[PDB]
Amino acid sequence: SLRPKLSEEQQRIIAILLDAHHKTYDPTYSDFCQFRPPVRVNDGGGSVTLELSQLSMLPHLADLVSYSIQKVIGFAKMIPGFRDLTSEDQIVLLKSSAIEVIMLRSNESFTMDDMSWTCGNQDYKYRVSDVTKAGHSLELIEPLIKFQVGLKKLNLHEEEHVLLMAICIVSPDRPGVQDAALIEAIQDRLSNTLQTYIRCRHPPPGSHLLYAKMIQKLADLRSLNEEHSKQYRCLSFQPECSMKLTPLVLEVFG
Ligand SMILES: C=C1/C(=C\C=C2/CCC[C@]3(C)[C@@H]([C@H](C)c4ccc(C(C)(C)O)o4)CC[C@@H]23)C[C@@H](O)C[C@@H]1O
Numbered sequence: 001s002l003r004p005k006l007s008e009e010q011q012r013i014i015a016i017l018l019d020a021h022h023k024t025y026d027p028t029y030s031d032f033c034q035f036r037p038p039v040r041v042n043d044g045g046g047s048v049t050l051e052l053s054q055l056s057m058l059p060h061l062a063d064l065v066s067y068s069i070q071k072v073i074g075f076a077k078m079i080p081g082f083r084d085l086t087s088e089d090q091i092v093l094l095k096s097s098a099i100e101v102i103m104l105r106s107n108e109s110f111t112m113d114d115m116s117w118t119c120g121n122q123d124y125k126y127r128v129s130d131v132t133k134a135g136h137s138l139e140l141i142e143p144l145i146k147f148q149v150g151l152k153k154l155n156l157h158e159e160e161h162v163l164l165m166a167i168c169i170v171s172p173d174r175p176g177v178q179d180a181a182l183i184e185a186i187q188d189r190l191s192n193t194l195q196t197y198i199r200c201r202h203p204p205p206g207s208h209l210l211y212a213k214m215i216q217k218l219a220d221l222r223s224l225n226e227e228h229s230k231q232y233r234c235l236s237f238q239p240e241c242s243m244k245l246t247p248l249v250l251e252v253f254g
Helices: 008-024 048-054 058-077 087-108 128-132 138-152 158-169 180-201 210-236 247-253
Strands: 116-118
Touching: 008 058, 008 158, 008 180, 058 087, 058 158, 058 247, 087 138, 087 158, 087 180, 087 210, 087 247, 128 138, 138 210, 158 180, 158 210, 180 210, 210 247
Parallel strands: none
Antiparallel strands: none
């Protein structure tokens, strides 16, 4: 069972992606006080009527997601080969993957301590009850939490985490892509880097079938993407919803 060494180029790709992530993911969440403030209405009963009437957490979470899409755009532009694509394909890939990369990158704030995304004091701790206060339902939230725990338990090296985000973005099977072959060539270069990295740098037993497990998470993300889109559609029917979102969020999901 051969373990070819990482090529000079593969090492450079990993370094570039690590740098890109470090430049676009602030692990202190220090910008979050700039978003519209979180508001949490009394909704212990999980009333859909109340949740939609108030959408109390939506301005804050929409601002968080919008900010994150901006960061993902920056990250993607640093992926080796991404700028070889036409502008048209670049935008198709970004719009189609945005929610998935947000779900992946959020794993860094997710904690199994209490099953929350913890981004600071209580104000910026996001629980399932906060997501329902933004107008989403359990059909999305429950599998989202299951996804976060499963990803956590893979214990990815940061190298593997950034590669997975890059592979997710540069996917040739997204609707509307023009040069699928070029996209696939870029993705293959990243996939080969990841497979090679795992085999020579990830110790047992966590390395066992790890590449296959990571590829399965990409398939899981497709499912969550589809469910999020259905739910965003519903959310959009609420009068005055657009003011609680942002122009970038409206474009990406509308
Ligand atoms: C973003 C990041 C973070 C959390 C992501 C969360 C927690 C709150 C609920 C969110 C935002 C989920 C929620 C279902 C969601 C995603 C997009 C939307 C809207 C409200 C736009 O429909 O709602 C998806 C990702 C979830 C915090 C930090 O890790 C940065 C990361 O980019």
